[PDB]
Amino acid sequence: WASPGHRGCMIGNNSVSLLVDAWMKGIQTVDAEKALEAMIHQTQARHAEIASVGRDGFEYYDKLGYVPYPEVPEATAKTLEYAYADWCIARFAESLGKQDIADQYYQKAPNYRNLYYPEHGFMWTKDAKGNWRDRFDATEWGGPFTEGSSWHWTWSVFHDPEGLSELMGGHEPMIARLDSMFVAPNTYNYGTYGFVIHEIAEMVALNMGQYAHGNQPVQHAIYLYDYIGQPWKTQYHLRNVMDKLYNSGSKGYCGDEDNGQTSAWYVFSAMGFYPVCPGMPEYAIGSPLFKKVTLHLPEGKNFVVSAADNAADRPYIRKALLNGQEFTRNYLTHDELKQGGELNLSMDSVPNQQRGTQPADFPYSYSK
Amino acid sequence: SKKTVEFVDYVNPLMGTESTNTYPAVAVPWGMNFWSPQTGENGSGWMYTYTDSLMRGFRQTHQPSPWINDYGTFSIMPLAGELKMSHKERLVPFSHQQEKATPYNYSVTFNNGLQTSLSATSRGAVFEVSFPEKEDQYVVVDAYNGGSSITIEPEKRLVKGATRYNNGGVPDNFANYFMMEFSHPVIEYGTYNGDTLLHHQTDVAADYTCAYLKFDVPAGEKLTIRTASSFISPEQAAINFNREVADADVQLISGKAREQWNNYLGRVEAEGGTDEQLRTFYSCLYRTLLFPREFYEFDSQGNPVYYSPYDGNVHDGYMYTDNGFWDTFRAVHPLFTLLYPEVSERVTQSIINAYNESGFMPEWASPGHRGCMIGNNSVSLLVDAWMKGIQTVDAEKALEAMIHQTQARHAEIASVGRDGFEYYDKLGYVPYPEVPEATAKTLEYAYADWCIARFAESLGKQDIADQYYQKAPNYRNLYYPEHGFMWTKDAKGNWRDRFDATEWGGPFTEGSSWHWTWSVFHDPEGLSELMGGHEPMIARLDSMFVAPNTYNYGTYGFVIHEIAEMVALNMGQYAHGNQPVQHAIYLYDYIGQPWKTQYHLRNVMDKLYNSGSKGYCGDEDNGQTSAWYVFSAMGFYPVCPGMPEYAIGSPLFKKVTLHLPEGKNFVVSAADNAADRPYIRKALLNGQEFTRNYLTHDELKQGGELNLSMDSVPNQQRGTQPADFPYSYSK
Amino acid sequence: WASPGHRGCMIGNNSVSLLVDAWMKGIQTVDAEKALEAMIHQTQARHAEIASVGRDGFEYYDKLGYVPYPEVPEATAKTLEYAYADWCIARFAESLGKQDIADQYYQKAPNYRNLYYPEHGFMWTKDAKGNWRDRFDATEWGGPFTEGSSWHWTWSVFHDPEGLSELMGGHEPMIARLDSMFVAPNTYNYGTYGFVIHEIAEMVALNMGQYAHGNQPVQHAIYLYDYIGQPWKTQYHLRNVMDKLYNSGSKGYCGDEDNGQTSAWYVFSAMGFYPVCPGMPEYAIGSPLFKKVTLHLPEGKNFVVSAADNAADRPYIRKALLNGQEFTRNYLTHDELKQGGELNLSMDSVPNQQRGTQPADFPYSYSK
- Are the C-beta atoms of residues B232 and B621 closer than 8 Å to each other? no
* The residue type at A103: D
Minimum-distance CB partner of B549 among C135, C247, C254: C254
CA distance A362 to B138: 32
- The answer for residues whose C-beta is within 8 angstroms of residue A116's C-beta and 6 or more apart is A122, A123, A124, A167
The span from the CA of B549 to the CA of A354, in Å, is: 47
Q: Cβ contacts of residue C142 below 8 Å, gap of 6+?
A: B499
**Counts of helices then strands in chain C (DSSP H, E):** 12, 12
Q: Degrees (nearest 5) of the Cα angle B470, B476, B478?
A: 125
Q: Alpha-carbon distance C155 to C81, whole Å?
A: 11
- Please check whether residue C244 is in contact with residue C269, taking contact to mean a CB–CB distance below 8 angstroms: no
H or E segment at B351? helix B341-358
Q: Determination technique for this PDB entry?
A: X-ray
CATH 1.20.1610.10 for the B418-583+726-731 domain, yes or no: yes
What sign results for the dihedral spanned by CA atoms B198, B201, B202, B203?
negative
> Given an 8 Å threshold on Cβ–Cβ distance, is B552 in contact with C256?
no
Query: C-alpha distances in angstroms, B248 versus A296, B36, B128, B159, B256?
Result: 69, 20, 11, 17, 11
Mutate to test the interface with A, among C189, C204, C210 (most CBs of A within 10 A): C189
Min Cα distance A92 → chain B (Å) is 37
Residue of B nearest to C248 (CA): B552
Question: No. of H helices and E strands in chain B?
Answer: 18, 36
Fold of B268-291+584-725: GH92 mannosidase fold (3.30.2080)
Residue B587 main-chain phi, psi, to 5 deg: -70, -25
Other Cβ atoms within 10 Å of A134 Cβ, number? 12
For domain B1-267+292-322, the question of CATH label 3.30.420.40 is answered with: no
Distance from CA of B563 to the nearest CA of A (A): 7
Q: Is C197 part of the contact surface with chain A (CB cutoff 8 Å)? A: yes
Q: Could you tell me which residues come within 8 angstroms of residue C117 by beta carbon, excluding any fewer than 6 positions away?
A: C123, C124, C132, C136
* Strand stretches in A14-136, DSSP E: 116-117, 122-123
Two domains, one topology: C55-220+363-368 and C221-362: no
SS3 at position A179:
helix
Nearest to C247 among B552, B556, B571 (CB): B552
> How close B455 gets to chain A, by Cα (Å)?
39
Give the gap in angstroms from C-alpha A187 to the nearest C-alpha of chain B: 7
For C48, residues 6+ apart whose C-beta sits below 8 A from its C-beta are none
Q: Establish how many alpha carbons lie within 13 A of residue B427's alpha carbon, considering only the half-sphere containing its beta carbon.
A: 23
Segments making up each domain of chain B, as ranges = 1-267+292-322, 268-291+584-725, 323-417, 418-583+726-731
Type of residue numbered B93 = P
Three-state SS at B99: strand
- Mutating which of A120, A132, A186 best tests the B interface, going by the most B Cβ atoms within 10 A? A186
Q: Please, what is the Cα angle at B256 between B251 and B261, to 5 degrees?
A: 125
Chain C residue closest in CA terms to A135: C135
Contacts of A206 in chain C (CB under 8 A): 188
Letter for the amino acid at A57? G
Half-sphere exposure of A84 (CA within 13 A, CB side): 29
Nearest to B592 by CA among B459, B441, B401, B720: B720
User: Rounded to whole angstroms, how far apart are CA atoms B336 and B380?
Assistant: 13
Angle at alpha carbon of residue A188, lines to A182 and A192, rounded to 5°: 120
Rounded Cα distance, B328 and B351, in Å: 14
Q: How do beta strands A341-348 and A302-306 pair?
A: parallel
- Residue B617, classed as helix, strand or coil, is coil
**Contacts C196 to B, Cβ<8 Å:** 556, 559
Phi/psi of residue B269, nearest 5 degrees: -100, 110
Residues found in chain A: 368
- As a 3-state breakdown, chain B gives helix, strand, coil percent values, each rounded to 5, of 30, 25, 45
Resolution in A: 2.3
Between positions 594 and 633 of B, the ones with CB within 8 A of A are 606-610, 617, 619
Query: How far is it, in rounded angstroms, from Cα C75 to Cα C142?
Result: 10
CATH of A55-220+363-368, one of 1.10.3720.10, 1.20.1610.10, 3.40.50.300, 3.40.50.720: 1.20.1610.10
- Chain C residues lying within 8 Å of A135, measured CB to CB: 135
Please indicate whether, in this complex, the C-beta atoms of A353 and B54 are within 8 angstroms of each other: yes
Query: For B234, how many CA atoms within 13 A lie in the half-sphere containing its CB?
Result: 10
Give all strands of the β-sheet with A282-285 in edge-to-edge order. A273-274, A282-285, A331-333
The DSSP H or E segment spanning B130 is: strand B124-130
Distance between A244 CA and the closest CA of chain C, angstroms: 6
Among B500, B550, B553, the residue to mutate for chain C (most C Cβ within 10 A): B553
Contact B567 C243 (CB under 8 A): no
CATH class held by domain B323-417:
mainly alpha
Q: Which amino acid is at C264?
A: A
Helix ranges restricted to H, A67-225:
75-95, 99-106, 150-153, 161-168, 171-181, 195-208
The listed CATH number (3.30.2080.10, 1.10.10.10, 3.30.450.40, 3.40.50.720) that belongs to domain A221-362:
3.30.2080.10
Q: How far is CA A309 from CA A248, A288, A320, in A?
A: 24, 11, 12
Best B496, B551, B560 member to test C by mutation, with max C CBs in 10 Å, is B551
Please tell me if residue A187 touches chain B, with a CB cutoff of 8 Å.
yes
Q: How far, in whole angstroms, is CA B515 from its chain's centroid? A: 21
Q: How far is CA C61 from CA C58, C75, C115, C280, in A?
A: 5, 10, 12, 24
The DSSP annotation for B147-201 comes to SEEEEEEGGGTEEEEEE---SS---TT--EEEEEEESS---EEEEE-SS-EEET-
- Spatial separation of the C-alpha atoms in residues A143 and A162, rounded to whole Å: 28
